[PDB]
């Protein structure tokens, strides 16, 4: 089980030849928080879906790791911007378990806000405005046509903005053909810069890997499969593969041509996660006794929205995951 890449493949398979874009950490963090109030088989599926084994120590480490990450981000980044946060919007009628609220505040630094879900329009405005603010206007209207039977919405957001360590020169950007397929061509602004880059020719998966650094410790990795090998590369993606690429990188001089682009992803994860074995939490048989003792509580949907902008100066990326609970 490989969470990030099994999820990637599920999304890719659900929408062939389409752009794909999401934040693995936003979703994993959301699932980890969800597990705090899950029980029995419902919790089991979530932990196994995240790639954990049956050891209690692994569960403790899961939360400890995320708590450490959130605390680390409370310190100013060096050279760029990276924000990650959580919030619970709960209706006054809802009675959350003391332990769940405490765990959310302590482990996930979650914000807690009262919400009148009977006022669907008002609830959407409150939550969407919050998400937009936290993502500096990049994630707008996360929630659309809200159920109205909603009682709690758990939100995770992530915002990233960084300048390339070395920018592309605007005078080096020219219109070029982009081959979606050998027969489908689209015109795109193609940026370019000759420089030394971390590079690797992966003969196993058949792709070229290039690392492009951001100011700070973050980096972008661009993967170009050989002709006709995108499916092969997608099938081979894994945590191990990524580790291999990052450690085997070698410095090489390249005249790099990369398109200036902006793409996004909008998903109803409740329809996708069952592919990773996470299904009970979305049913009437969900065991969410840890979040509320109220009967018939389940997750109606888990919406994810992610966007990215890549240009000559750098990259801006953001995402949010809204987990909606109903009675």
């Amino acid at each position: 089980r490989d969470f990030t890449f099994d999820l990637y493949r599920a999304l890719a398979s659900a929408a062939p030849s389409q752009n794909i874009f999401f934040s693995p950490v936003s979703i994993s963090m959301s699932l980890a928080m969800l597990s705090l109030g899950a029980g029995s088989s419902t919790k089991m599926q979530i932990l196994e879906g995240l790639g954990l084994n049956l050891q209690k120590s692994s569960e403790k480490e899961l939360h400890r790791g995320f708590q450490q990450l959130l605390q680390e981000l409370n310190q100013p980044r060096d050279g760029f911007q990276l924000s990650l946060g959580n919030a619970l919007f709960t209706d006054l009628v809802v009675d959350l378990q003391d332990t769940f609220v405490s765990a959310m505040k302590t482990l996930y630094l979650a914000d807690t806000f009262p919400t009148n879900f009977r006022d669907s329009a008002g609830a959407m405005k409150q939550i969407n405005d919050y998400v937009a603010k936290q993502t500096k206007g990049k994630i707008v209207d996360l929630l659309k046509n809200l159920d109205s039977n909603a009682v709690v919405i758990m939100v995770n957001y992530i915002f990233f903005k960084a300048k390339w360590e070395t920018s592309f020169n605007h005078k080096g950007t020219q219109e070029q053909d982009f081959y979606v397929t050998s027969e489908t061509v689209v015109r795109v602004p193609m940026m370019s810069r000759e420089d030394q880059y971390h590079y690797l020719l992966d003969r196993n998966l058949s792709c070229r890997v290039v690392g492009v650094p951001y100011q700070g410790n973050a980096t972008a990795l661009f993967i170009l499969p050989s002709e006709g090998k995108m499916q092969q590369v997608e099938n081979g993606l894994s945590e191990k593969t990524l580790r291999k690429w990052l450690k085997m990188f070698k410095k090489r001089q390249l005249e790099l041509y990369l398109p200036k682009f902006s793409i996004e992803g909008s998903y109803q994860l409740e329809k996708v996660l069952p592919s990773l074995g996470i299904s009970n939490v979305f049913t009437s048989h969900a065991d969410l006794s840890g979040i509320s003792n109220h009967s018939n509580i389940q997750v109606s949907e888990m919406v994810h929205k992610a966007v990215v902008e890549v240009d000559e100066s750098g990259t801006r990326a953001a995402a949010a995951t809204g987990t909606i609970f109903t009675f």
Binding site: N19, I20, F21, S23, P24, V25, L82, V180, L224, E234
Partner: peptide, 28 residues
Amino acid sequence: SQRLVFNRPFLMFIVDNNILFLGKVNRP
């Protein structure tokens, strides 16, 4: 210098001791 052009579908990772974002640019 070796000329490398991303003019076919490609993948993008944004990493920092964690996979912050992951995607496929199929149709820019």
